[PDB]
């Protein structure tokens, strides 16, 4: 990170604020009128006192109450207008920033999410954006509303007697440098607090997602001690912020009151008095007194504003990170399905050992390739390379004769349907899980046909509402095989030219697996398929069986040929 300024963060924000200039312009006009009303109301002491209540004609006091009430009506109207317009613009800007942040996170590479924690990014969405919102609404309204008041008081004081606006001038730069120093301090503390809040969210999220492990292994004390640590650190950094703010405010108040001391001392001179009455000074010492109150408001709201300025700076740094590399530009309507690995070598980020070494694998159109091998040998990695979750080091992966990097990511991933090894469902009705991202495109007859092909219809008919049954947060209201079959139906609904089954039948019994296999045989007789299997009963009819070991292909063939040749596959078949 690298701090900027308040002006510099507003110069970064400006392209976002530009579409909403009208609200800002009317808010600025209303702010000017509000400051004018305040200053004019304070400058009523001069006629009230000089043109005495009984010394001079009461003509002033005849009309003065109506003037006060009218000024208050005008000030109220302009205060409403300025508050509402600035808050509307601020809400719009914060909404835009939140949406940009969400889209940016959705566009990051998978390797980014491997190295992160959900709590940190969730904190970026929740805590930092709420800091921007709170600051830019409340603290910004107050800052502008006291700055205008201070400027009005300065103008009035310089108008009545400039020989004291001179001390105001000589004291303004000191206040400016003090405020700038304290603001930099505040921005640093705020960034620290953002990191600590990310840690707090990560701690709570880890306890919540692993609740069953906490219970079963008795991890209550450890989780409680980790939350004690992080929450105490959050409190201590908040106290750092408070210490800075409450040591800064009295110093600035003292500097500002040196002006009041100077005005009293200067009036103590006889060479300055007798030039002005009692009433001009009735305005001037009333105005110094009434100036020290907006100063406090301004300084006191500075920490809250800087909590928003620091959050904005953090979001700006995030919003120009590198997203998923997408520099291909040829869409594909429907691939034939002819995927070919050509001498590819892949190393996971930060791992220094190849997960795959020299993979020369052809997956012809309409043929099924089965990857078998021991656990940890690199089958899910091949499946992850086909969908471009990770990018390879050497070699080429071609689809329809062109490298995968030549296509658009959306266009490419439209050609692949994947049942992953770790099934993830959503908190949605069974029907909105089978048709996850295409609920407007697939009818209920198509969804029921997919659910029937995945052997999921019998258990769905027994549920509370059928296809409208809400399943839990991650399908938690289902058994493991039922979650697997819903994921299978989700993949089978979309007639994608490439289907990848990454051990799709691990949680299924044998009869269920055989029914699903019977459906797959008829449905996918002409679609490229890649089955990753540990059970060799699932892949006996594959057109080519590929045995992976430590990341290299150790043999390839059909079931009958691989049963002869007495290789690795014959050993796997024998021990099963």
């Amino acid at each position, epitope marked *: 990170d690298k701090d900027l300024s308040t002006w510099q963060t507003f110069r970064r924000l400006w392209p976002t604020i530009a579409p909403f200039k009208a609200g800002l312009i009317v808010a600025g006009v209303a702010l000017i009128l509000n400051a004018a009303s305040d200053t004019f109301m304070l400058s009523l002491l001069k006629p009230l006192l000089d043109d005495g209540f009984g010394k001079t004609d009461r003509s002033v006091l005849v009309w003065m109450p109506l003037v006060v009430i009218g000024l208050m009506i005008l000030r109220g109207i302009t205060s409403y207008v300025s508050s509402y317009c600035i808050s509307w613009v601020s809400g719009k800007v914060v909404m835009t920033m939140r949406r940009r942040l969400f889209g940016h996170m959705m566009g990051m590479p998978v390797s980014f999410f491997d190295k992160q924690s959900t709590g940190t990014l969730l904190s970026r969405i929740t805590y930092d954006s709420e800091q921007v919102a709170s600051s830019s609404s409340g603290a910004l309204i107050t800052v502008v509303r006291e700055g205008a008041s201070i400027i009005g008081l300065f103008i009035m004081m310089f108008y009545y007697s400039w020989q004291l606006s001179i001390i105001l001038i000589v004291l303004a730069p000191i206040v400016s440098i003090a405020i700038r120093v304290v603001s930099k301090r505040f921005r640093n503390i705020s960034k620290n607090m953002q990191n600590t809040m990310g840690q707090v969210t990560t701690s709570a999220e880890q306890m919540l997602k692993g609740h069953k492990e906490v219970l079963i292994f008795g991890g209550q004390e450890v989780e409680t001690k980790r939350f004690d640590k992080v929450s105490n650190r959050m409190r201590l950094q908040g106290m750092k912020m408070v210490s800075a703010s409450s040591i800064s405010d009295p110093i600035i108040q003292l500097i500002a009151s040196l002006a009041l001391a100077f005005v009293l001392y200067a009036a103590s001179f006889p060479s300055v008095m007798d030039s002005l009455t009692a009433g001009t000074i009735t305005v001037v010492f009333s105005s110094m007194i009434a100036l020290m109150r907006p100063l406090k408001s301004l300084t006191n709201v500075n920490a809250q504003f800087q909590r928003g300025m620091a959050a904005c700076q953090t979001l700006f740094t995030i919003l120009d990170s590198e997203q998923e590399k997408d520099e291909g530009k040829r869409v594909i309507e429907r691939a034939t399905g002819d995927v070919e690995f050509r001498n590819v070598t892949f190393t996971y980020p930060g791992r220094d050992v190849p997960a795959l*070494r*020299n993979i020369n694998l052809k997956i012809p159109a309409g043929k099924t390739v089965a990857l078998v091998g021991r656990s940890g040998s690199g089958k899910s990695t091949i499946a992850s390379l086909i969908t471009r979750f990770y990018d390879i080091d050497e070699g080429e992966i071609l689809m329809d004769g062109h490298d995968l990097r030549e296509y658009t990511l959306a266009s490419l991933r439209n050609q692949v349907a994947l049942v992953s090894q770790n099934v993830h469902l959503f908190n949605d009705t069974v029907a909105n899980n089978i048709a996850y991202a295409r609920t407007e495109q697939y009818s209920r007859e198509q969804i029921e046909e997919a659910a029937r092909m995945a052997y999921a219809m019998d258990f769905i008919n027994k549920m509370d509402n059928g296809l409208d049954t809400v399943i839990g947060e991650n399908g938690v209201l289902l058994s493991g095989g039922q979650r697997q079959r819903i994921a299978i139906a989700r993949a089978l609904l979309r007639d994608s030219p490439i289907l990848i089954l990454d051990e799709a039948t691990s949680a299924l019994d044998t009869e269920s697996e055989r029914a699903i296999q019977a459906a797959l045989d008829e449905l996918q007789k002409n679609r490229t398929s890649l089955v990753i299997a540990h059970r060799l009963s699932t892949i006996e009819k594959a057109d*080519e069986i590929v*045995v992976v*070991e*430590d990341g*290299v*292909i*150790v*043999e*390839r*063939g*059909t079931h009958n*040929d*691989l049963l*002869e*040749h*007495r*290789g*690795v596959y*014959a*050993q796997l078949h024998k021990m099963q």
Partner: nanobody, 113 residues
Framework: QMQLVESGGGLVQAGGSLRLSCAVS????????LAWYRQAPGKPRENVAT???????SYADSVKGRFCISKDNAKSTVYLQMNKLKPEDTADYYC????????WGQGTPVTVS
């Protein structure tokens, strides 16, 4: 690309001994599966011996106890030692790398009187 060339024998007498070689290049030699196939003039290709990563050799029943398949990691070469040959063994011999759908050799005829 992986290529492999046999350097074998020609005509030998019955009951003799032969030793075939097949230098494998451009491969992860210590992991992949190597095998020896033979093709009689009329019969289709038949597996004869297979060796795997752990040097776990397997022999076709029709030839078990007479042949011996071994590989030298340093030289990147796989050997087929034949003992007590028979006229029925007269065929064209191929080395194979990683499976019946993998990479094949050009062939080396072997004749037994």
């Amino acid at each position: 690309q992986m290529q492999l060339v046999e350097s074998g024998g020609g005509l030998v007498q019955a009951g003799g001994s032969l030793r075939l070689s097949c230098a494998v290049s451009g491969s992860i030699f210590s992991i992949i599966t190597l095998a020896w196939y033979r093709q009689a003039p009329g019969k289709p290709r038949e597996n004869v011996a297979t060796i795997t990563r752990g040097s776990r050799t397997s022999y076709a029943d029709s030839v078990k106890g007479r042949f011996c398949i071994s590989k030298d990691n340093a030289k990147s070469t796989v050997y087929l030692q034949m003992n007590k040959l028979k006229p029925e063994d007269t065929a064209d011999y191929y080395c194979n790398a990683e499976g019946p759908a993998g990479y094949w050799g050009q062939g080396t005829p072997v004749t037994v009187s």
